[PDB]
Short mmCIF file of C-alpha atoms and ligand atoms in Angstrom, two decimals:
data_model
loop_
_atom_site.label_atom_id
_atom_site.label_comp_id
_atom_site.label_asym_id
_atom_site.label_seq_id
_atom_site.Cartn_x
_atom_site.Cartn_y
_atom_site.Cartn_z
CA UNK A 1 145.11 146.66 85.19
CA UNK A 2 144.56 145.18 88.73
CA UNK A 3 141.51 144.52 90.86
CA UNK A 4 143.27 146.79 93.12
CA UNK A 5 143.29 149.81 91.02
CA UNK A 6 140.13 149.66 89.11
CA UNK A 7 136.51 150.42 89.89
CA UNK A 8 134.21 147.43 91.14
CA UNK A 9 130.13 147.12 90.11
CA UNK A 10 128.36 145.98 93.39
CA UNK A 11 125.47 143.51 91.07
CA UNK A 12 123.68 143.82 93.99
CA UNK A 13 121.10 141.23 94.14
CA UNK A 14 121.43 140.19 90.10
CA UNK A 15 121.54 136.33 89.54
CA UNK A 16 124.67 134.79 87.80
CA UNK A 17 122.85 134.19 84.63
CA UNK A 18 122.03 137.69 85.00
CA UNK A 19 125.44 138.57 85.26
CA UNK A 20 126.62 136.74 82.37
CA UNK A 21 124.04 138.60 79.90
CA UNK A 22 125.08 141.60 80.88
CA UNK A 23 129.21 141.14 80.71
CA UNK A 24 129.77 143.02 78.01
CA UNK A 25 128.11 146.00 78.99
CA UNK A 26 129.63 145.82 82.46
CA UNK A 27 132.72 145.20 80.76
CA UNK A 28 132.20 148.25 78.29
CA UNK A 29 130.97 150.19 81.36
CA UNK A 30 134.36 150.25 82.49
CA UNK A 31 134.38 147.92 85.62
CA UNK A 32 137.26 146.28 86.08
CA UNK A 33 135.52 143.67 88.72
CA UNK A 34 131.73 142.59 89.87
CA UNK A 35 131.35 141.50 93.32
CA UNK A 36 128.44 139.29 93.41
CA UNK A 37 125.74 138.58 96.76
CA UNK A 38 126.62 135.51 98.69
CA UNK A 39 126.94 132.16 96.67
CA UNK A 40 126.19 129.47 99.26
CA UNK A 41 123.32 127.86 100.14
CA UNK A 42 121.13 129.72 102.80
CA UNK A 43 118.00 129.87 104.52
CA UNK A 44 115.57 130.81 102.07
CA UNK A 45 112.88 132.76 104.23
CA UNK A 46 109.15 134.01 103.12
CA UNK A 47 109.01 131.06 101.64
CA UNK A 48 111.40 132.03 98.76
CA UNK A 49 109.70 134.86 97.54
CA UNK A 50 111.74 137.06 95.65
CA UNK A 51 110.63 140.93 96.89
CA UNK A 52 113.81 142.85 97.22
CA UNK A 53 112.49 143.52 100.85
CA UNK A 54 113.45 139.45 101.44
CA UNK A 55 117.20 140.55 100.46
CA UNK A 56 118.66 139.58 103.90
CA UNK A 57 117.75 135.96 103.62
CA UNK A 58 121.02 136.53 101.40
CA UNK A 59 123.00 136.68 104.56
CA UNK A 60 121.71 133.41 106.47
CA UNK A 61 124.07 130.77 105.42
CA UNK A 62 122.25 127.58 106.18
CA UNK A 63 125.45 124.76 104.00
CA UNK A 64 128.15 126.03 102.31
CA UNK A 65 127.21 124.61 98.85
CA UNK A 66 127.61 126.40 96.70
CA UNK A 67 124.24 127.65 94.83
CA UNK A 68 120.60 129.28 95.53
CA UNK A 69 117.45 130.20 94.77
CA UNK A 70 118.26 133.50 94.39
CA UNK A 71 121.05 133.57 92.18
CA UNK A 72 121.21 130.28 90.77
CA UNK A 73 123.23 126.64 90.46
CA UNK A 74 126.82 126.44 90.82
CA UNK A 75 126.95 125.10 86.95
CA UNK A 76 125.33 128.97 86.44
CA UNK A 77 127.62 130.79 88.43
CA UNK A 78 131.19 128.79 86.85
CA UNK A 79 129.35 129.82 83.84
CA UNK A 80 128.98 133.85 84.53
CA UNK A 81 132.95 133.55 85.63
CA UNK A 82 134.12 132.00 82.74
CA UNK A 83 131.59 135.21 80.68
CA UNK A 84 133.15 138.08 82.74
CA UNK A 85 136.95 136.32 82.00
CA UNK A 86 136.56 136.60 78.15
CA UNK A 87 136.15 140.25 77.96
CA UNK A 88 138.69 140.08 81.18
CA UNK A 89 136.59 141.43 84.17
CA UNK A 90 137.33 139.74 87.98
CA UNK A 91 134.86 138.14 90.42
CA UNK A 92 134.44 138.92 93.66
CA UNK A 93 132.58 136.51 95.96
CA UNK A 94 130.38 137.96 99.15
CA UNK A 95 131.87 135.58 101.64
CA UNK A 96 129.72 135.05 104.50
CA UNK A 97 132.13 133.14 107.15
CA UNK A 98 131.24 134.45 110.38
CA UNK A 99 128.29 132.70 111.19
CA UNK A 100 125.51 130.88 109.61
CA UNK A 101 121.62 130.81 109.86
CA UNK A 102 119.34 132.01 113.24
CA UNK A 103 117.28 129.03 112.69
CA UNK A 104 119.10 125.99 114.00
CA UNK A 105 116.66 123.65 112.26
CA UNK A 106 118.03 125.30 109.24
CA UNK A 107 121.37 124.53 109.71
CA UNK A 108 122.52 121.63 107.64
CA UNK A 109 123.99 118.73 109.27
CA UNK A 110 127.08 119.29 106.71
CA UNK A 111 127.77 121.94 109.58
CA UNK A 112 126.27 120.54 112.73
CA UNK A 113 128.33 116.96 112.26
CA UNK A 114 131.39 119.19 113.35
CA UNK A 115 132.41 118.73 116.34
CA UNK A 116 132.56 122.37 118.64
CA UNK A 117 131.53 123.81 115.32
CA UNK A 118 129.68 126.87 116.58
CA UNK A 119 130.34 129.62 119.96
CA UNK A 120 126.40 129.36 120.44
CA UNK A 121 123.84 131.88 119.34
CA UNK A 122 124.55 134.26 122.19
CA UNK A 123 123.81 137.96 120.97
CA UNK A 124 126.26 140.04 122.03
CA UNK A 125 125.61 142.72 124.52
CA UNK A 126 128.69 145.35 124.49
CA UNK A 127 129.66 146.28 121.03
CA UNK A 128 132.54 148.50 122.80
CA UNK A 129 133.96 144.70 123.71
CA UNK A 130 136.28 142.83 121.22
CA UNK A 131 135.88 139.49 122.75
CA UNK A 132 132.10 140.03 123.04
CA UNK A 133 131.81 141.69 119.45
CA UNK A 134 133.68 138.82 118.46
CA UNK A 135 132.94 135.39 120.28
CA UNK A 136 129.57 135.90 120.41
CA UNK A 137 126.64 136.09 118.53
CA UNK A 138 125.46 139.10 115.96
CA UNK A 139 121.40 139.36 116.07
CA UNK A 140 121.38 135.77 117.37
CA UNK A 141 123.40 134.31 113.97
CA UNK A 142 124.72 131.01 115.05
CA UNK A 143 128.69 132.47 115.71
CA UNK A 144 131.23 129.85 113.98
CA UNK A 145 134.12 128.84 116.24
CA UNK A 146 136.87 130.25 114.50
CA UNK A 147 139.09 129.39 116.52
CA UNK A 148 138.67 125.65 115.74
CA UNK A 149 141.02 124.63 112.77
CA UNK A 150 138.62 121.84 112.08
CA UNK A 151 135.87 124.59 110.73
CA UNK A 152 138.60 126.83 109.29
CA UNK A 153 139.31 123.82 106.73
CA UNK A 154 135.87 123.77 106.29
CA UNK A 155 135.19 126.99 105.35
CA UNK A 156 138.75 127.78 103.52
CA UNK A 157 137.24 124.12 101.34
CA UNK A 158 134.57 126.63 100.35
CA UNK A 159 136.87 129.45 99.50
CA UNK A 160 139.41 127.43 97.46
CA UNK A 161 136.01 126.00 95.41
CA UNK A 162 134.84 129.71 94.86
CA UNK A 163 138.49 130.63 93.31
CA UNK A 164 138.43 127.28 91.15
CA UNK A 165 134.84 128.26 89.58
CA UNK A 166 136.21 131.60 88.19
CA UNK A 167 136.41 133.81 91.56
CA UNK A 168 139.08 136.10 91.69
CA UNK A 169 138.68 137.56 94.92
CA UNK A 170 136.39 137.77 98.46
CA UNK A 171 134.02 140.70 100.23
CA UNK A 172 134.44 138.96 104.15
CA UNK A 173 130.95 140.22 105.34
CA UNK A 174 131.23 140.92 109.20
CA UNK A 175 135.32 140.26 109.06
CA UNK A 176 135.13 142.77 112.45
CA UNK A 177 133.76 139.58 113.97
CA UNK A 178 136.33 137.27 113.57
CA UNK A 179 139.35 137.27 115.92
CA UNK A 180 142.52 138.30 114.64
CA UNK A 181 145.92 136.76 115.53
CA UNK A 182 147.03 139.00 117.97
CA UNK A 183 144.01 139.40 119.74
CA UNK A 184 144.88 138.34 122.92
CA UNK A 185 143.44 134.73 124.77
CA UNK A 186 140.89 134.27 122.47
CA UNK A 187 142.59 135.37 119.10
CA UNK A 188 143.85 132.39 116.36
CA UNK A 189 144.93 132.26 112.97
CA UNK A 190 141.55 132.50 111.17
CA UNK A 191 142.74 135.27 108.91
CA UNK A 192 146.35 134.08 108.05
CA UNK A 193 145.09 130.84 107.25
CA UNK A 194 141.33 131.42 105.09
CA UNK A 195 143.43 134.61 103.08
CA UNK A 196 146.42 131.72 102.12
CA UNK A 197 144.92 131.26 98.46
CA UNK A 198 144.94 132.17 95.10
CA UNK A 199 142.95 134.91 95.26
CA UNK A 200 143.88 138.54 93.75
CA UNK A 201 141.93 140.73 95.64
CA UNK A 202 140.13 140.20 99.23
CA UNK A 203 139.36 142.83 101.85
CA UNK A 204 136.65 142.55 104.61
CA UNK A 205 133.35 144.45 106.05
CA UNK A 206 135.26 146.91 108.48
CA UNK A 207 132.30 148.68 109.75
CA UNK A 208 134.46 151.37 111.76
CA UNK A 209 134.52 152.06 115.65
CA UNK A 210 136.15 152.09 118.87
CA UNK A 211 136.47 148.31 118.46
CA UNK A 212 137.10 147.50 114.32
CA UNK A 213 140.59 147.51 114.96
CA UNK A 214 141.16 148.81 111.09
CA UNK A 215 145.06 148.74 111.01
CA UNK A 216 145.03 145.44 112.26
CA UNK A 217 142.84 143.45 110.09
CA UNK A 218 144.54 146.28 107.04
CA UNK A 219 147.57 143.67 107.47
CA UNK A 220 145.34 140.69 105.62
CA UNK A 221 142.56 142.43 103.81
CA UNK A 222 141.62 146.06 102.32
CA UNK A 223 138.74 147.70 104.91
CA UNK A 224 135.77 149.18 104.02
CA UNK A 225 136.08 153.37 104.45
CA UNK A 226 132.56 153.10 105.89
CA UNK A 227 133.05 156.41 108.04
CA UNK A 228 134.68 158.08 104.39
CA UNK A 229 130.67 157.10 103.68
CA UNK A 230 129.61 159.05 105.72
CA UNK A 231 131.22 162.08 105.04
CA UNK A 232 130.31 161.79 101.06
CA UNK A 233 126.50 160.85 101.60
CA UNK A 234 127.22 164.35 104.54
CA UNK A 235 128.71 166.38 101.96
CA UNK A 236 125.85 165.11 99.32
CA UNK A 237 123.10 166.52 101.48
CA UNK A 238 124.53 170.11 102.27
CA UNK A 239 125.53 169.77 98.59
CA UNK A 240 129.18 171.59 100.36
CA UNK A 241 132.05 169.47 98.51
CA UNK A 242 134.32 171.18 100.61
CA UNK A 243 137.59 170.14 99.87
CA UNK A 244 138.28 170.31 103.90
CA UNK A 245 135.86 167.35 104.76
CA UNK A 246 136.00 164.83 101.90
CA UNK A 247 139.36 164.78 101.64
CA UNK A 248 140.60 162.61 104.33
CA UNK A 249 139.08 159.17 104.61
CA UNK A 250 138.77 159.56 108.05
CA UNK A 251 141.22 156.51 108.94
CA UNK A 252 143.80 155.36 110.13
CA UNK A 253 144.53 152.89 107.32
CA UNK A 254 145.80 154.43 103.53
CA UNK A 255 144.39 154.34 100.85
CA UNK A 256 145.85 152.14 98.76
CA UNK A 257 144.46 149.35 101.45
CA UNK A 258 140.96 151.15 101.27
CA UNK A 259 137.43 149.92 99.56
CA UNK A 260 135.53 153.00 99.28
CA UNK A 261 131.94 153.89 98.46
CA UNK A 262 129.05 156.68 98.07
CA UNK A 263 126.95 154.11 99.97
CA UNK A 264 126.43 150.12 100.87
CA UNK A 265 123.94 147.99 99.87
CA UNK A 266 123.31 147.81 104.00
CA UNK A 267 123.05 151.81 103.91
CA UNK A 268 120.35 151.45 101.18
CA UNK A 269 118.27 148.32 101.66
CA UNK A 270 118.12 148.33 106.29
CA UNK A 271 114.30 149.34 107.62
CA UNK A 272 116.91 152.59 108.90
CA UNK A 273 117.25 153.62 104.84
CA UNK A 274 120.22 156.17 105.97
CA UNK A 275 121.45 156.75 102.25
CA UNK A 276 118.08 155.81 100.39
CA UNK A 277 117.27 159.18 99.95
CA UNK A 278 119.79 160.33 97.49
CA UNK A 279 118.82 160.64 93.77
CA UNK A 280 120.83 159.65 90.30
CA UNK A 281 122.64 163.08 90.77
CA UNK A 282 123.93 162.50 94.04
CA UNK A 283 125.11 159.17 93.12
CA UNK A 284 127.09 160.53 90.05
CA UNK A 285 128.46 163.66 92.27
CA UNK A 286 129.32 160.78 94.78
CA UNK A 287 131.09 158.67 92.15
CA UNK A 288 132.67 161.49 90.85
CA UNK A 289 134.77 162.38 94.19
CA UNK A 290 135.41 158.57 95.30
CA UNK A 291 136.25 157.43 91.67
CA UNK A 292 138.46 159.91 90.52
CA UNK A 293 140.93 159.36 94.34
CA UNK A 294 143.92 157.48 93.86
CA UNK A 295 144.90 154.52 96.19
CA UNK A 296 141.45 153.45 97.44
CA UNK A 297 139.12 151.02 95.65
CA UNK A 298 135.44 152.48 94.48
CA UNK A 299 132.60 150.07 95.02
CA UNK A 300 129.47 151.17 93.03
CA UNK A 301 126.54 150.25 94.12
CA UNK A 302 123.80 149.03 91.57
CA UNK A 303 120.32 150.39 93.20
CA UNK A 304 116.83 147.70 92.60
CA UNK A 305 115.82 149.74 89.17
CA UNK A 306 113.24 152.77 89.97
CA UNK A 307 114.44 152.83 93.77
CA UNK A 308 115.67 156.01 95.05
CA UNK A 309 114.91 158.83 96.35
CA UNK A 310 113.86 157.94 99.76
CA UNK A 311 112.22 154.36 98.10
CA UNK A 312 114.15 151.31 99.29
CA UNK A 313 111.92 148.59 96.66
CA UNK A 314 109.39 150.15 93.98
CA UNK A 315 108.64 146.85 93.17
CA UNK A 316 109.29 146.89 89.13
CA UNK A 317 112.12 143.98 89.83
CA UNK A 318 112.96 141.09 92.32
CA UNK A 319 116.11 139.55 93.85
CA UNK A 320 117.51 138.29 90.41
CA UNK A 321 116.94 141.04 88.12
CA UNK A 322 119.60 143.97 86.75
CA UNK A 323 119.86 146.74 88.73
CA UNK A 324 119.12 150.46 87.29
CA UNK A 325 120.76 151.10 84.26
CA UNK A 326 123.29 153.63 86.35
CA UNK A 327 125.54 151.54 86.30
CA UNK A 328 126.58 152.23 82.46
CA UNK A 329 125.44 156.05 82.80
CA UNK A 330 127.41 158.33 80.65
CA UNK A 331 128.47 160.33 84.01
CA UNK A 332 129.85 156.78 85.60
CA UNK A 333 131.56 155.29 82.92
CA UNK A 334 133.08 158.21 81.96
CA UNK A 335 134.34 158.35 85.72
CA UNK A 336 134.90 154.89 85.44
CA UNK A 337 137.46 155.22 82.26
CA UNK A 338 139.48 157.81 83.89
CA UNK A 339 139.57 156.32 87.03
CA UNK A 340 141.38 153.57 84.69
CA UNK A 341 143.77 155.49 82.59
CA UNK A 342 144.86 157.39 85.67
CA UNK A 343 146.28 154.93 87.66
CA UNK A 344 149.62 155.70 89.20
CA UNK A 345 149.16 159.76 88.61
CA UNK A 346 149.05 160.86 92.06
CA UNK A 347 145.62 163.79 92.90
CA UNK A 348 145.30 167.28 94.51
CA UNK A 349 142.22 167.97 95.37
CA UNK A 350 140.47 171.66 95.85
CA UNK A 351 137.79 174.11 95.15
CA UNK A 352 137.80 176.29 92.32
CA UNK A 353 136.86 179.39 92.67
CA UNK A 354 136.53 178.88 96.36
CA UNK A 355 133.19 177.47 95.95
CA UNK A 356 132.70 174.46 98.24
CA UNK A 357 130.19 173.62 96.07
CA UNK A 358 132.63 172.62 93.12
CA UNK A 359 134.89 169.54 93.29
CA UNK A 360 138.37 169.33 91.22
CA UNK A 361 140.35 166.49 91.31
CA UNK A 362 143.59 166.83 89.27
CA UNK A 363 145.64 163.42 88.45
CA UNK A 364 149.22 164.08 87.87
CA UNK A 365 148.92 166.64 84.60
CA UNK A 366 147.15 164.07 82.56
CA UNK A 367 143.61 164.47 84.15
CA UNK A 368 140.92 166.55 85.99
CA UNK A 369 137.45 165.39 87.32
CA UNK A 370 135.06 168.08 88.24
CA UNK A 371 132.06 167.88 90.40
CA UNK A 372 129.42 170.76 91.21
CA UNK A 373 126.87 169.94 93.53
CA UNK A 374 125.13 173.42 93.14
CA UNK A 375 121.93 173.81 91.41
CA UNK A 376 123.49 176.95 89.55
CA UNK A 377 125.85 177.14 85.89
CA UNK A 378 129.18 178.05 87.31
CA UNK A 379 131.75 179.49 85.45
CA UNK A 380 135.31 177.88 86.22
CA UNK A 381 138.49 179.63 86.35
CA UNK A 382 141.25 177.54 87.56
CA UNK A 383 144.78 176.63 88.04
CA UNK A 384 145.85 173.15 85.94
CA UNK A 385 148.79 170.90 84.76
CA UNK A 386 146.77 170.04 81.50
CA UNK A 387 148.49 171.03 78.42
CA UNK A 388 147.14 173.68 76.78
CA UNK A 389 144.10 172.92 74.11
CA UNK A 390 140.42 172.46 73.94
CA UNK A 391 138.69 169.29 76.07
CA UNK A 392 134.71 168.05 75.65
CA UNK A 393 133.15 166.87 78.86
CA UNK A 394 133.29 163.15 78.67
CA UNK A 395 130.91 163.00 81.77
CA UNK A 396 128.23 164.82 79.10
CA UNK A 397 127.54 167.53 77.23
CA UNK A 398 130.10 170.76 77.16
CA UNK A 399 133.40 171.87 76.53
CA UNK A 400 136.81 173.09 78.14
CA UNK A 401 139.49 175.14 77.40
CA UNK A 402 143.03 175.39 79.03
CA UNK A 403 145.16 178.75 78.13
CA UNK A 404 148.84 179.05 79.55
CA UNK A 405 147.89 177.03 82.81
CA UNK A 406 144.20 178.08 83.63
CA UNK A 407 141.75 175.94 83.03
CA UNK A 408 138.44 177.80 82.26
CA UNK A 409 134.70 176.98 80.79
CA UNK A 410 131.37 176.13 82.06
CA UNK A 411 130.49 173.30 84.54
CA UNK A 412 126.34 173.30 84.41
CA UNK A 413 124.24 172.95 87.68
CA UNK A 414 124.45 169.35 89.34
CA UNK A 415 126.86 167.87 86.49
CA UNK A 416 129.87 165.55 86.36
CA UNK A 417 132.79 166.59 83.85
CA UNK A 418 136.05 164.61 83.13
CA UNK A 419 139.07 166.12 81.11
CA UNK A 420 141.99 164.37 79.50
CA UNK A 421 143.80 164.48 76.22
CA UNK A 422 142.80 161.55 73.72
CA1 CA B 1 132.33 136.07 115.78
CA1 CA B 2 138.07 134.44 86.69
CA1 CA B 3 110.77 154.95 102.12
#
């Protein structure tokens, strides 16, 4: 369909080449987008060694080449575009605008011969201040002057080479650091300008608070539901799916301009590991709720295969490699699919049975997802729109039945189901 209304995989770390192997499953897995790690050229810490635990080097832009150690040449990542496009998946591009590299002897002199090219290395001090959280400095991250059109070209350049070598869209890491338009004496027309292009999809890293200013930067980009997060990974723990907590995204933008997700790569991989601890099951329970919502956009994101579980990097793969094989689980891609073929059909959320521990998601009358975090068999008994007949869990193993409106069967301990007519 649309970037928009489809699911995206988050290949979290997994080169272009190792992208491009694995199209067809992703494709088959029913992603209709990848968003890969940032493609420019940055700092390449630890001496380049590849441990997962190096995966912020990822995040130190050092020249705006395009190409890395980590995920390969440009030539390589044209080359994993042009693979997703023949079985018709998107590319979405981390950008990393905001700033560039700590390390000023880093910095290439691509960047430095810009005249006023940077607002200094300054950390910021009051994260409750928008000029401070965004004309200065985020951990000591050189801070690009935004405001000066002569680096906007020179970033937008970058952009507008991304979208020619098969990118169909942008992920604006720390967009809550650039100024917007209206902010005031130090605002410009960063945004306006660097989302002018051809791209089909772009929304930015809106991580929310008193000073994100969500609505605002909802007029050029989706936002991250990053406090919706919160109240998944919440609801994951208690294992209560109440209907009265994960319902609202918790807000003020809709929906339909929303990027949602069970958890970040940043919730995962930080020495805080505030989502790390979830299992396989969580994750599918998680994908379950987010991916069967209308409006918002799911981002799934591919864990470093064996972590979980409270471990961040079992070290049986490097910054490169596939992630776990989760991302084509039966459960997910059968979320996935519906997800698709639901598009449009509007939800109603609830809990059947009254049991906050069971999720229903009903799409218009041509779907239902259900969701039971419990570690008990549960026997559903519920209203539905379905037509009447007999439906087999495409999540896994089971069956459904729907007689004169009620929709009734068994819904085993910890299990994803999805229900639709063929
Ligand atoms: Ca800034
Ligand atoms: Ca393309
Ligand atoms: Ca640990």
């Amino acid at each position: 369909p649309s970037i928009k209304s489809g699911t995206i995989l988050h290949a979290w770390n997994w080169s272009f080449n190792t992208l491009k192997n694995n199209m067809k499953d992703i494709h088959d897995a029913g992603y209709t987008a990848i968003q890969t790690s940032p493609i420019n050229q940055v700092k390449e810490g630890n001496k380049g060694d590849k441990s997962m635990g190096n995966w912020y080097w990822l995040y130190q832009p050092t020249s705006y080449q395009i190409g890395n150690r980590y995920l390969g040449s440009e030539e390589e990542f044209k080359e994993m575009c042009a693979a997703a496009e023949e079985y018709g998946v998107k590319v979405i591009v981390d950008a990393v605008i905001n700033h560039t590299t700590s390390d000023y002897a880093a910095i290439s002199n691509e960047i430095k011969s810009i005249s006023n090219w940077t607002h200094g290395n300054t950390q910021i001090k009051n994260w409750s201040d928008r000029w401070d959280v965004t004309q200065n400095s985020l951990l000591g991250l050189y801070d690009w002057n935004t405001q000066n059109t002569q680096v906007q070209s020179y970033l937008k350049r970058f952009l507008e080479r991304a979208l020619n070598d098969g990118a169909d869209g942008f992920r604006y890491d720390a967009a809550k650091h650039i100024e917007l338009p209206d902010d005031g004496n130090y605002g410009s027309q960063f945004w306006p300008n660097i989302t002018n292009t051809s791209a089909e999809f772009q929304y930015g890293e809106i991580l929310q608070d008193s000073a994100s200013r969500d609505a605002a930067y909802a007029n050029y980009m989706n936002v991250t539901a990053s406090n919706y997060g919160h109240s998944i990974r919440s609801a994951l723990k208690n294992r209560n799916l109440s209907v009265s907590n994960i319902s609202h995204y918790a807000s003020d933008v809709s929906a339909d301009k929303l990027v949602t997700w069970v958890e970040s790569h940043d919730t995962y991989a930080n020495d805080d590991e505030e989502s790390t601890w979830m299992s396989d099951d969580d994750i599918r329970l998680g994908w379950a709720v987010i991916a069967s919502r209308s409006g918002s956009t799911p981002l799934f994101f591919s864990r470093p295969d064996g972590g979980g579980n409270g471990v961040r990097f079992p070290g049986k793969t490097q910054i490169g490699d596939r992630g776990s094989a989760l991302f084509e689980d039966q459960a997910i891609v059968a979320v996935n699919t519906f997800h698709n073929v639901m598009a449009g059909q509007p939800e109603e959320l609830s809990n059947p049975n009254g049991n906050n521990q069971i999720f229903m998601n009903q799409r218009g009358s041509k779907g239902v997802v259900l969701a039971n975090a419990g570690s008990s068999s549960v026997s559903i008994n519920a209203s539905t729109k379905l037509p009447d007949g007999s439906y087999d869990n495409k999540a896994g193993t089971g069956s459904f039945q729907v007689r004169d409106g009620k929709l009734t069967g068994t819904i085993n301990a910890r299990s994803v189901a999805v229900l639709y007519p063929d």
